[PDB]
RNA sequence: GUCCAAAUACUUGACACAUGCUAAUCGAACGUUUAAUUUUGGCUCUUAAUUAAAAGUGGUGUACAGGUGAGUAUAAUAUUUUUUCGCUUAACUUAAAGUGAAGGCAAAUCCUUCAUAUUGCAAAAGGAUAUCUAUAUCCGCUUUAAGAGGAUGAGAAAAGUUUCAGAGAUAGGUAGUUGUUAAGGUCAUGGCUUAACAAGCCAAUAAUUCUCUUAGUCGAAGCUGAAAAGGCUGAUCGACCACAUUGGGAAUGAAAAAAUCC
RNA sequence: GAGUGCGUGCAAUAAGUUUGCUUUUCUGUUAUAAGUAAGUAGACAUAUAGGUUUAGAUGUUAUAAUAGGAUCCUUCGUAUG
């Protein structure tokens, strides 16, 4: 959020919740994508390596 | 940036025999060879197929052997094009209109397609300029009444 | 382990607590001999005493656990309660030379708002002042201009169970039509003829 | 909800004609549903209406509605109201305003901003202050909003005069002091009295109507006329209680009212410019009207507050009085002989009657 | 509305839950989009352990669950708690200290 | 015929059904009534309110879940693999901007319209809670950009697959129908659409059409064989199709995907 | 001779419904007309006052053209013969 990039504190209790939840979904997507990408690469290599 | 060129991808080449010709402009029925596998009998059966091949310059007579390529879409029922002639029928190959190369045929599409977009951008701009002049004329008659009525008040306050 | 919370002025005894949560739970008021038996007895012990059906028992265990956490219902904060009745009054202030902040406070029935200290002048939560002299809030009956009271009414804090209006959506037509046939009989046969 | 508007008490024949015209063509149609009301004002249904006129059950016998030419048949609402208003010389003649203004509220008739100020004057100069206060309290039906700064200034003026009439007698003053508080609470709490026009008038004065020095001086006038009489335990408790309000309001008005600022300088210079808000004060005839009681208030309050041992308040109140008295005297030398302004001030401040 | 929830499988008095990714308005046990993991409510006991401790066996694909949570998947109360223990999300309920 | 646990339990008349139940929920969307309680005014009548119940108006959900197998005889705008793409104003995530003005109903976040919303088309709705001796939040609403999802576009091209019930009759079928030129339309392709000519296209062993009989379809799903692209069934499980007394129909909505509605 | 949950032709037909050489009607813009009803503007004067007076810039009413949506009829259309 714009208010989060400017270093402003949460407006109220609920704002703190949304900030934490949204951040939990940000780190869950990064690790999810990068985590799943390594699986694919590790899997494709096995097929190609074992097929060659 | 605004023009979408054709794929221009080469495909497989099939050798067939022209069955019919001269019935419709730039089109001949070629008979190619195929094979279908019967899973129950574990036996291959001859599965010949007949397609409508696009003859651009009408340089094919019924009876000659040709080489056709798929993926060239010219009509609803036509998806094949003539690559070249293997063996002529009746007259030599040198006595018929030359078969345009696939590059030449593709260039016609791009040129024709590119020209089409040039017409649209002109029609769109003209239609927009033809509609902005009618919307600016309403402002004229509307702006004069306002200025003619608003200045009347301004003059009665000095 | 089962910590007991001290009674609050608005809820001095058990009969009051069981009366506020309604759901006809005041039948087992005599089961609990003391105030600590309500917060010490367990499920199994509430089943032998006769607290039934299971809906009323689980509902009591919930409000019980909800009382220990200080999640009181309307009127819980009240400190100046008298025999189950409290009085609300408007406390005017001066937030600016042209405004006025009115707060619904709870003071003794006899004393006046301006005759109380900050510690003895509680601000009841959930009650607001609309206009210059109207106290608006659930279960706030007016006594005078700027004075209202909260009588301890059965089902004060209860969570009403949704009741089907007329047989429900599926059966609404049948109950209405079937009841319309029992009305035209009294009008015509029992009374008309 | 409410009973249908009706006028059944008319002393003169002209009054009835003016009301019956407005009633049967501007007020009665408002009781119709939306669909049937879009037919009376159409020509395509003129022939059909003649055969089957619309009906509405109004206190028994249904009514009848035929074609009404919107441009010609419709009457001028402002004119008729004026005619009907001028021809009112009886208690029952003014009892129709509650119904009249109620009908115009149903018809969404934007009435003149100054109309509310006029009805208060004519109705109060005949002895019917209650009829006006009853409509102000019943603002949900009549639509007698206290939008204009003048209307509230005209209402409080008569309220004081009715108490000042009988030499500020305790029975009426006690009742009169309740009417002012009834209004100050309405302007503040009630929302029906708030409109765009009032927001513009508050932004020009920088004082809300409930905290306006001009209106707060009326409550300090009656409060000062109560402590004077007494300053029997039950009555002695009231006196001591009225001295607290006096010192409280006396200290609340001095804060708002700046130092040495009269009526024509209290508000911003941009308030007196526009004629739709706070321009009546400019005329000398109207300034002395609302400057008589407010002036005597400070003089009468400075005295009592001085007997109790309040130096600061005494000088403060006298400061405003000195600045208002000077401005008042100025307008007294310009008001034409015979105007109500010169008379009222002469009878109140001059103590001549 | 993608939801991380439990599909109950097992026999009478033998519950065995199956963590799935399915649309909200669908049958509980219908074939879901993905099967993240499994959950066993009844706590077990280590074979050669006389201390008396108990544990719950949960096979969960953290990597796959994280992606779905990042695109708007709404885990239920039961699953939210399980994810909290692993540290993916914050607890939805906490014990009152006072 | 002693006991216990698990799992199965109208396979037939989609025959007719007593009784109670299977879809409701929000008062922090909205006012109406009735009661008490406190107030005005006039001397019980009458204003303005608070509160609590009872019916509603609204929003969302009854498009999920659960039930049945009557009808239904298929190769089709059906289906994979790769390449290339399109749409998606409801809900779910992330963020930004905007949330003003009237009328109608008893009132409304219900109807109708208006101002503004990069240029010009084109929006919205208000409610609630705190602080001070107006300010700041909370739940919403509208629009915009993306992610996810989708029941989405006839998506397209290339190369493939799909054991298609049984019996009997039928040699023609196709009229934007097949192709060319030109133009529009489309992300693109395609008579997708139109104009103008040409007389083509599919099929011959039944393409096409017709009648009868029978049937919900499928899966190591169930049973069975040593095995066969095995055979049978089509209960419980999962997927798909159809139906809700029979027949004939439309709207709403992002989408009929209803035990709704006519 | 009896029956028929079957197909089909014709007549008929509820809900619904294609089309417009239909029958009314609402709204939207565009162009005019009016200023009496309303609403929005400006000018002058009055004083227990708030009256006189002109004006269309938004908007209101009227007509015309034009776009769209409901109605009426038309066509198709269960039952039924
Ligand atoms: K079936
Ligand atoms: K027929
Ligand atoms: Mg059965
Ligand atoms: Mg369903
Ligand atoms: Mg708003
Ligand atoms: Mg290949
Ligand atoms: Mg076609
Ligand atoms: Mg069957
Ligand atoms: Mg089945
Ligand atoms: Mg017919
Ligand atoms: Mg006029
Ligand atoms: Mg028939």
Swiss-Prot record, chain A:
Highest taxon of the lineage: Eukaryota
Protein's cellular compartments: Mitochondrion
Summary of the function given for this chain in its UniProt record: Component of the mitochondrial ribosome (mitoribosome), a dedicated translation machinery responsible for the synthesis of mitochondrial genome-encoded proteins, including at least some of the essential transmembrane subunits of the mitochondrial respiratory chain. The mitoribosomes are attached to the mitochondrial inner membrane and translation products are cotranslationally integrated into the membrane.
Family of this protein: Belongs to the mitochondrion-specific ribosomal protein mS26 family.
Quaternary structure note: Component of the mitochondrial small ribosomal subunit (mt-SSU). Mature N.crassa 74S mitochondrial ribosomes consist of a small (37S) and a large (54S) subunit. The 37S small subunit contains a 16S ribosomal RNA (16S mt-rRNA) and 32 different proteins. The 54S large subunit contains a 23S rRNA (23S mt-rRNA) and 42 different proteins.
Name listed for the protein in its UniProt record: Small ribosomal subunit protein mS26
Organism: Neurospora crassa (strain ATCC 24698 / 74-OR23-1A / CBS 708.71 / DSM 1257 / FGSC 987)
Classification of source organism: Eukaryota, Fungi, Dikarya, Ascomycota, Pezizomycotina
Residues of the full protein shown: 107 to 158 of 316
Curated annotation (Swiss-Prot), chain B:
GO MF terms, alphabetically ordered: structural constituent of ribosome
Keywords: Mitochondrion, Ribonucleoprotein, Ribosomal protein
Organism of derivation: Neurospora crassa (strain ATCC 24698 / 74-OR23-1A / CBS 708.71 / DSM 1257 / FGSC 987)
GO biological process: translation
InterPro entries (alphabetical): NA-bd_OB-fold (IPR012340), Ribosomal_uS17 (IPR000266)
Keyword Transferase in annotation: no
Subcellular location per the Swiss-Prot or TrEMBL entry: Mitochondrion
Transmembrane segments: none
Role noted for this protein: Component of the mitochondrial ribosome (mitoribosome), a dedicated translation machinery responsible for the synthesis of mitochondrial genome-encoded proteins, including at least some of the essential transmembrane subunits of the mitochondrial respiratory chain. The mitoribosomes are attached to the mitochondrial inner membrane and translation products are cotranslationally integrated into the membrane.
Any one of the GO CC terms: ribosome
Keyword Ribosomal protein: yes
Record protein name field: Small ribosomal subunit protein uS17m
Assembly notes: Component of the mitochondrial small ribosomal subunit (mt-SSU). Mature N.crassa 74S mitochondrial ribosomes consist of a small (37S) and a large (54S) subunit. The 37S small subunit contains a 16S ribosomal RNA (16S mt-rRNA) and 32 different proteins. The 54S large subunit contains a 23S rRNA (23S mt-rRNA) and 42 different proteins. uS17m interacts with the F(1)-ATPase inhibitor IF(1) dimer.
Stated family: Belongs to the universal ribosomal protein uS17 family.
Pfam families registered for this protein in UniProt: Ribosomal_S17
Swiss-Prot record, chain C:
Protein name per UniProt: Small ribosomal subunit protein mS41
Annotated organism of origin: Neurospora crassa (strain ATCC 24698 / 74-OR23-1A / CBS 708.71 / DSM 1257 / FGSC 987)
Family: Belongs to the mitochondrion-specific ribosomal protein mS41 family.
Function: Component of the mitochondrial ribosome (mitoribosome), a dedicated translation machinery responsible for the synthesis of mitochondrial genome-encoded proteins, including at least some of the essential transmembrane subunits of the mitochondrial respiratory chain. The mitoribosomes are attached to the mitochondrial inner membrane and translation products are cotranslationally integrated into the membrane.
Coverage span on the entire protein: 43 to 235 of 236
Gene assigned in the entry: fyv4
Keywords annotated in UniProt: Mitochondrion
Main location: mitochondrion
Complexes and interactors: Component of the mitochondrial small ribosomal subunit (mt-SSU). Mature N.crassa 74S mitochondrial ribosomes consist of a small (37S) and a large (54S) subunit. The 37S small subunit contains a 16S ribosomal RNA (16S mt-rRNA) and 32 different proteins. The 54S large subunit contains a 23S rRNA (23S mt-rRNA) and 42 different proteins.
The UniProt record lists the keyword Repeat: no
Swiss-Prot record, chain E:
Location(s) in or outside the cell: Mitochondrion
Predominant subcellular localization, coarse grouping: mitochondrion
Database matches in InterPro entries: Ribosomal_bS16, Ribosomal_bS16_CS, Ribosomal_bS16_dom_sf
Keyword Mitochondrion: yes
Pfam families: Ribosomal_S16
Keywords: Mitochondrion, Ribonucleoprotein, Ribosomal protein
Gene Ontology BP terms: translation
One Gene Ontology cellular component annotation held by this UniProt entry: mitochondrial small ribosomal subunit
GO MF annotation terms: structural constituent of ribosome
Subunit organization: Component of the mitochondrial small ribosomal subunit (mt-SSU). Mature N.crassa 74S mitochondrial ribosomes consist of a small (37S) and a large (54S) subunit. The 37S small subunit contains a 16S ribosomal RNA (16S mt-rRNA) and 32 different proteins. The 54S large subunit contains a 23S rRNA (23S mt-rRNA) and 42 different proteins.
Family: Belongs to the bacterial ribosomal protein bS16 family.
Function: Component of the mitochondrial ribosome (mitoribosome), a dedicated translation machinery responsible for the synthesis of mitochondrial genome-encoded proteins, including at least some of the essential transmembrane subunits of the mitochondrial respiratory chain. The mitoribosomes are attached to the mitochondrial inner membrane and translation products are cotranslationally integrated into the membrane.
Protein name according to UniProt: Small ribosomal subunit protein bS16m
Species in which this protein is naturally found: Neurospora crassa (strain ATCC 24698 / 74-OR23-1A / CBS 708.71 / DSM 1257 / FGSC 987)
Source taxonomy: Eukaryota, Fungi, Dikarya, Ascomycota, Pezizomycotina
